[PDB]
């Protein structure tokens with residue numbers, strides 16, 4: 001298990017009660033404890049799953065993310081202050097880190113501690129042996145669900161490669177003097193192999209926290225680290241679905257016709273695509289049992305609901321987003337019936353789907369990308385949202401996050417583009433762009449049409465179809481696809497006139513053009529401009 005002398009080596013003192021490798025049954029009674037107060041509390045829903053509140057923090061806090069700049073990360077990290085693109089990798093001094101470590105370790109000292117040992121990465125050769133230390137039971141549950149649960153033999157000789165101490169209950173009083181964003185903090189020290197959290201309870205910080213570390217370590221060894229969903233067909237054909245938050249990675253990869261490899265984080269080495277996690281983190285806002293049966297069915301004992309509204313009788317109102325629109329539910333991957341096992345990996349991907357939810361209603365439901373359009377759109381990392389739908393009218397807000405996940409990038413986005421291209425070319429992979437977002441109808445395309453589109457991409461129908469070039473973006477779109485409504489296939493059809501579509505295509509194109517300018521500092525990046533939209 002674990003001794004108090006080892007926890008002391010970390011800096012945590014007077015730990016009397018230690019719960020090493022808590023079981024799901026223990027975690028279950030821990031959360032349901034009637035004498036719990038505030039955010040540690042869990043309630044039982046009629047679906048058998050416990051629901052908790054993550055507190056004030058209902059999403060990640062990129063503004064509070066810091067990485068210690070020392071001789072190990074100085075020349076390798078994609079620093080937010082080196083003027084090479086917008087990122088959240090703000091530098092932190094070794095000195096301020098020690099103060100933060102003091103805060104967290106002291107907060108955890110003299111407390112009952114949960115110690116969850118787990119792996120990040122399905123392969124023994126590149127995975128991280130992470131030890132999570134926390135004082136909140138549902139947080140230990142979150143990481144038991146989301147990371148790879150070792151076997152008794154792996155636990156026997158478990159030597160941690162990284163430690164993440166969650167001091168969510170403590171805050172940083174010296175922040176103003178230290179030049180930080182607030183009293184909260186999500187800091188990382190690559191020299192000490194540690195992550196510290198304070199102020200925010202949100203479990204997503206640990207998840208995306210180790211992802212950022214994999215995003216740093218893997219590409220440096222020639223392995224692609226990707227923000228993508230992934231599944232395999234019965235033939236052995238692997239597909240990866242890149243995309244920003246809310247685009248459909250989890251919704252679409254969870255298809256009964258294919259075996260789920262993972263839903264959010266994967267690597268791509270010499271053998272293929274491997275999952276980093278041990279669970280799935282599904283969105284539950286307006287969740288439909290009919291539209292997403294497999295995900296709904298996964299919600300039961302051992303799944304951990306978050307911020308959803310639970311009525312008196314224990315029933316859940318999934319449509320209620322008053323606490324947050326980011327309602328979620330984590331669960332072990334095995335809660336999905338059709339998955340790859342025992343190990344969550346498979347062969348090289350041949351299909352690479354870039355999902356995007358276009359609030360502008362410009363991009364087409366699907367288009368097969370050229371080799372250059374693939375790189376252009378990868379570095380672009382576009383998606384948009386109807387910000388203000390609650391305050392009035394549409395007003396689409398664009399988001400350009402490099403590699404479809406800049407918030408977790410620890411190296412320059414070109415380092416991810418390169419390793420990805422090297423993997424795609426060796427496997428002969430093909431890339432597609434899917435607009436899981438909006439049309440001229442002002443509505444989002446149906447999940448039915450979108451799934452029918454994904455089938456077409458995977459079974460080769462999209463490749464065999466006759467296509468024509470959509471103007472502005474110069475995207476090859478099919479004239480028709482099996483199971484998909486033909487009208488929506490061409491975005492101009494959903495408007496009163498193609499001129500109305502044109503107006504928007506022009507606005508969105510300038511957004512893309514302005515955003516891509518920062519990559520044209522190299523000859524290769526200058527050449528890709530030809531691949532993007534053109535006025």
Ligand SMILES: Nc1ncnc2c1ncn2[C@@H]1O[C@H](COP(=O)(O)OP(=O)(O)O)[C@@H](O)[C@H]1O
Pocket residue numbers: 243244245246247248249250251252282283284285436437444445446447448450
């Ligand atoms: N056509 C569509 N394709 C995918 N998701 C859709 C579609 N229409 C609506 N949605 C909703 O959009 C969200 C996509 O979420 P999810 O797959 O969890 O995003 P990601 O995993 O990329 O964050 C879900 O709430 C889903 O029900």
Ligand SMILES: [Mg+2]
Pocket residue numbers: 249250251263264281282283
């Ligand atoms: Mg997801």
